[PDB]
Subunit: 364 residues, 4 copies
Amino acid sequence: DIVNRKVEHVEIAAFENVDGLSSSTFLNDVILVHQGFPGISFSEINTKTKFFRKEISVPVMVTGMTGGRNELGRINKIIAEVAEKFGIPMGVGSQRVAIEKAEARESFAIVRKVAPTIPIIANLGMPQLVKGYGLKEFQDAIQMIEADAIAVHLNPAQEVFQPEGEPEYQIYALEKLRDISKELSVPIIVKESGNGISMETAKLLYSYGIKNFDTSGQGGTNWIAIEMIRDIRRGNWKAESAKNFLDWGVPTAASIMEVRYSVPDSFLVGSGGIRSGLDAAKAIALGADIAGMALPVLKSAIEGKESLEQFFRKIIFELKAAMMLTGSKDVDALKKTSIVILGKLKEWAEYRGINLSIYEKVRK
Amino acid sequence: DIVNRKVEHVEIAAFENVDGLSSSTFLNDVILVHQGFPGISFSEINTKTKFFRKEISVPVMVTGMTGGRNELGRINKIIAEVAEKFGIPMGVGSQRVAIEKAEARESFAIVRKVAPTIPIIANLGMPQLVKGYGLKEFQDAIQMIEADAIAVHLNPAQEVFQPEGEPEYQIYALEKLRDISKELSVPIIVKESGNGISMETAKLLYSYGIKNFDTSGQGGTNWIAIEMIRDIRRGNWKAESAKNFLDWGVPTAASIMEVRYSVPDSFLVGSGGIRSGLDAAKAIALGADIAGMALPVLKSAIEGKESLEQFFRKIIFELKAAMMLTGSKDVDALKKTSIVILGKLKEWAEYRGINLSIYEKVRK
Amino acid sequence: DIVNRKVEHVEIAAFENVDGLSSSTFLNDVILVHQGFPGISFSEINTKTKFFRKEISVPVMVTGMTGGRNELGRINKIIAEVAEKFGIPMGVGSQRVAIEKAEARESFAIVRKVAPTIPIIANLGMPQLVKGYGLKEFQDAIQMIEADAIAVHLNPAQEVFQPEGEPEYQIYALEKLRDISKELSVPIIVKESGNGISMETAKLLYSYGIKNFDTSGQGGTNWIAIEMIRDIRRGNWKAESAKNFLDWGVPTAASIMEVRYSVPDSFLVGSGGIRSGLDAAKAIALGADIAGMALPVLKSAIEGKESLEQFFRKIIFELKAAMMLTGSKDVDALKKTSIVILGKLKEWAEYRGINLSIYEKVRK
Amino acid sequence: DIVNRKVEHVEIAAFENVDGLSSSTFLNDVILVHQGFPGISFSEINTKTKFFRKEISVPVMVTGMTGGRNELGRINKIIAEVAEKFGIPMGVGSQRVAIEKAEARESFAIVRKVAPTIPIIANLGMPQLVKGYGLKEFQDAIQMIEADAIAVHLNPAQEVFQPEGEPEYQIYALEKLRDISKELSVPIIVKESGNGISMETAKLLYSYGIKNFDTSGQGGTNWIAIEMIRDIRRGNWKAESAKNFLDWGVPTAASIMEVRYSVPDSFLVGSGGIRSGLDAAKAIALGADIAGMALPVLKSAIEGKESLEQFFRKIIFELKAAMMLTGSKDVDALKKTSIVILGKLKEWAEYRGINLSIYEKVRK
Ligand SMILES: Cc1cc2nc3c(=O)[nH]c(=O)nc-3n(C[C@H](O)[C@H](O)[C@H](O)COP(=O)(O)O)c2cc1C
Ligand SMILES: Cc1cc2nc3c(=O)[nH]c(=O)nc-3n(C[C@H](O)[C@H](O)[C@H](O)COP(=O)(O)O)c2cc1C
Ligand SMILES: Cc1cc2nc3c(=O)[nH]c(=O)nc-3n(C[C@H](O)[C@H](O)[C@H](O)COP(=O)(O)O)c2cc1C
Ligand SMILES: Cc1cc2nc3c(=O)[nH]c(=O)nc-3n(C[C@H](O)[C@H](O)[C@H](O)COP(=O)(O)O)c2cc1C
Ligand SMILES: CC(C)CCOP(=O)(O)OP(=O)(O)O
Ligand SMILES: CC(C)CCOP(=O)(O)OP(=O)(O)O
Ligand SMILES: CC(C)CCOP(=O)(O)OP(=O)(O)O
Ligand SMILES: CC(C)CCOP(=O)(O)OP(=O)(O)O
Ligand SMILES: [Mg+2]
Ligand SMILES: [Mg+2]
Ligand SMILES: [Mg+2]
Ligand SMILES: [Mg+2]
């Protein structure tokens, strides 16, 4: 039944109209300044970067999506085996379903069988931490895929509108997380899920020892829309209310600025509606260390292995194009390349007290 | 004939295109910052608040609308009995028609028969104060429904365009109001009716001892539009002139900022185009103490009791969703949650000398 | 043939699509703050104001349009006799045609026969001043209609695109104007003709003794569009070039600000796209002493006397509505009522060094 | 085969939808202030200006386009003979094709046979400097047309997406350029090709001794779009990636401000989407010394000699119209005429640290 929600999520995300529905990343408000004389050759561009203790080929990761059933495991297999080939890290979806059901385990474990070298990121939800999960469940999630890190997701907006949702975000959960992190052999990443991380949330998490963030801002997969659709489907009246919240959240670009600014030493994944290598380049230039993608990887993987390989080729070419055209020889150079911030994003930053001058210093 | 206007008002408001016609609340310019870690559970959210000497369940009121005839009284009865059930305060429509016609009284009195505990708010127009109404008429309006307060409405824009309108707003009326307030057993609220309260008007009313305001800004029911339609109907040439004023007024959001800023200790209802619990949450976060609704309550009540009950359930769920997602455990926390002000509202505030820093301190 | 241009002008302005074509007044960027308690009664509003040595009923004038042929004279007659009835001043069109042709004189003179008391404003073009017109021509224009003032029009944009146009605006013309003003028994108003007066032009004219200005900004009658159409008609290739300049000029609202700011003691007509009494009210609140109108008076006059009477009633009602709703008892109060400046007009003012604070002081 | 790309470029530029495709010049954000009293006569307007050691009739140049084959040479012939007649300078297209193929030479040389007096500008691409071109190749390009200057183009964005592209922009190329300039008898202009010059690129080039720039910003011919179309045509998957970059680059207007500000003594060509004499006037008022045009000259030349003559008449009239209407008697006066900067251009400048006050001083 949790396994049912799992297939339904994939089905709605993949096949319904939920990508950027009534929402925005604000990334149109970010412009990378063109350099007519780049000072480099396309072929000397170096996209390698660090991901904790490993080196990755490209400053992009696939963020967590699925698992919990055979056909979900075969999607995970395709994603893992292509991510392995391209040298890019992969998060799996929530492993709750596999803590609850032993039959669901193989759909996660397959990932490490087929991807022995890339970083693999485990996944559990924050509500489970308030509902009995602790050290041993985290260790199980980690060992199940020989994870290099664990992502703990924030999805209170999704939980609020989800028919069987669990909107339990008591502070006790952070106390528990902080304790768990003491004993864990791998780092914790705290990621949102379509609604973004603000400076108040980032500072709170940091105060409990969290140093690794994944923005997952509005403007990509709309998880309120997905649950709205699940509510429409089962005649649940929360559907009409969900519609009022479709543009709820911190836009990806605003979230990147907010996290980088409020916690300048954070290791930061910029994700939520990254759809091209240009999006990826903007997210990095703005302040992220790596760009995250989920939905377009799902849709490609469903079409097949070769389709997903072509997808990654395209993303990597686009990223390098944006590095070439900004004179950025490597990832560090891109992080400090010249940008323009305009429009609503500029107004957002101004109101939120993000001094642009100190901002520019911090992102460089 | 006044009773005729009363039915015509309800009919045009309920069934014609007058809601936000060529007007705007500016509430799109207000964004509540999403908190990925709320620090609370949905079920611990407390929406109780004070309304003068009573406690109400939810920081929302139904503002005054109707009365004056049987079928208008049956609408009032539906509204009152549902408002009683939900623990929310209800204003009635103008009681002038019931001061003028004894047959109209029951259509107001029914309200207190069916709603013994909730705050009930009386209603008289400012133009009547200029035209001979005094203490006794106020006392009659109050006792008629055992009111906990009286609303005195400002509708000069409506009166200007109304075929039988009375645009008499001499300053003498305020001297009279101040005198009446000395002797009244319940507080006075001064409310607008679709065109909003500016700082000049708020400060003027305050200088005369008015401490309780209801913004009723532009962006919701368009009363100039209603009278334009009444003019079109009777071939009155004022109709074409009304069309030029459809976007006349202070937008609800700007009016909330203006009243809170210029009279920081005011008890403030934010109303005019509040259509969801998210609107309600924005209005409160901006500076209102409670959100007011009229038109969508009318339209639901016309459909029936159960329809109105479902409407309030939806509003309350949406409000609590916005409280959850900003980490607001109670109404006081919502009043000081993090916001972003963008666009035309920001430009409005800047021109009007609303220092945003002192504004943030004042709204808390 | 000049008489032909006169007929063609009226015909294109009245019946073709040239009103606000690809242009804007910026008046949407000006908002009059609504006062829910005006402090006045509609019937005590006083709209009287000064126009040089005469009193006028309403702070509105009909600006110069036509004359030069019988049917143009009958239009002038209708305008004059209604303007006389309403106590509002009337400018006539360019009297060049009547200096050049004795048969054209009656079409101007009729105006004073039918309107003995209102201010009547003569009209000559600046290019005529560079081409031989002097004191006597001015005196003839004045005595022809017993004028209370003379308007000298600036139309370089129109002259550039006009098939038989005369774009001669040598500085010598100003020396001449200054000399002529020494000897003239009535004041000179310098007016534009759809393209507006900037601060550089206003200060220049002031340095030569001009104190009376009529903005005639872009956003109403588009004179470049009129000449474009005349060019299209006669296969003149200047038509395609005119199209590139359709949005050329200082917007009416910007021009009012610019003239009031740069020449604070000016007597100022705000005109160019004034289409309602609300437009008129905004223009005066912004800084004008009176609002000017041409095109909509033309279109009404063509329909007839009664049609023009209804038009003025509508304008006057709308003005008084805007005065009522801002608590403006008289024209002086309107000149200092509260406004909001937003959008492009705000950006225009900022770039042009119009300090908003000193601006508010100067207009009040 | 390079000859083939040459024909294909002309064909796609002339006949496909690539002019301002998903791009913008930002020139709508620049407004020349209208002067109702110009202080001059149309006929006294002087448009003559300096182009290195020659005088040209009009502050406009045809920037480099084509050559390399007979039919391309006949286009160059038409352009050269009309440019000669109008006294305006002409750049030729890349002469690489003529260094590589002796048969291609006549298609460039024809230009000087038919245009003996106007400035003629040679052309070579920056990638060729990293690939073996040096002094002698420059001298050959120059002598081939008795050039008065050489343009070295920057096209890294084009090279990235070009099927046979050469995205080699190593810094060594500037070292070489600086050396070559020591020994060359004519000055070097560095020009972009539809994606614009930033302050970082301008300052870099300046640090290597480059004093003459041609902005070629986005908003006109979209070279990424041209290569996208060439990619679509040959089934190259880079096509989908090109689509993501269609709005990549510095908008012409922004580039003019950036180069003028960062290198205040530069000799500056403002080009990229200059389509009218009004565009030309804005570019000069903004900070350019001359306006450049390519695409609309190509399209006219393809129609014929008389068509191109009419095109230049139209451009010249529009320029003089804009000078008339700003009171600009000559090109120096236009360079310091009053402007307003609004919108995205204003935001661009602000973020990039272009102080508008020091900007106004520098451009005047
Ligand atoms: C079908 C699907 C399932 C997902 N499930 C999870 C989950 O189990 N755990 C998690 O942390 N994020 C999950 N996500 C959220 C993504 O990891 C990501 O944060 C979000 O979708 C925004 O990125 P995108 O716009 O590139 O999809 C899911 C995404 C998709 C499309
Ligand atoms: C049919 C109807 C009649 C109304 N009559 C009154 C009135 O008698 N007195 C009053 O103060 N306001 C009256 N109102 C104005 C409302 O109380 C409220 O201020 C305004 O409609 C804006 O709120 P809304 O957009 O939620 O309707 C009326 C509203 C409606 C829809
Ligand atoms: C048909 C017509 C002819 C006009 N001719 C004259 C003219 O002779 N002299 C003059 O000063 N302005 C003349 N005007 C310009 C107007 O006085 C006015 O400045 C301009 O039309 C802007 O006002 P509007 O938008 O209300 O028309 C003419 C206007 C119209 C509609
Ligand atoms: C068909 C065509 C070919 C071009 N080839 C050249 C080239 O060989 N060298 C060069 O420097 N620029 C070349 N350009 C770029 C233009 O000179 C100019 O910088 C750019 O097109 C922007 O101006 P526009 O928008 O007026 O076309 C070419 C332009 C066109 C339309
Ligand atoms: C986006 C995302 C977190 C989707 C998973 O949400 P979920 O609440 O269904 O996950 P759980 O299985 O952990 O409850
Ligand atoms: C919005 C609102 C005040 C509608 C009632 O206006 P009205 O002038 O019809 O009310 P009265 O019966 O008090 O005159
Ligand atoms: C708007 C306006 C001045 C129209 C009259 O322009 P015109 O050049 O036709 O007038 P003249 O008869 O004075 O030349
Ligand atoms: C715009 C422009 C420079 C077009 C010419 O680019 P190209 O790379 O084809 O020129 P080359 O022949 O110099 O390579
Ligand atoms: Mg969950
Ligand atoms: Mg009334
Ligand atoms: Mg003329
Ligand atoms: Mg090349």
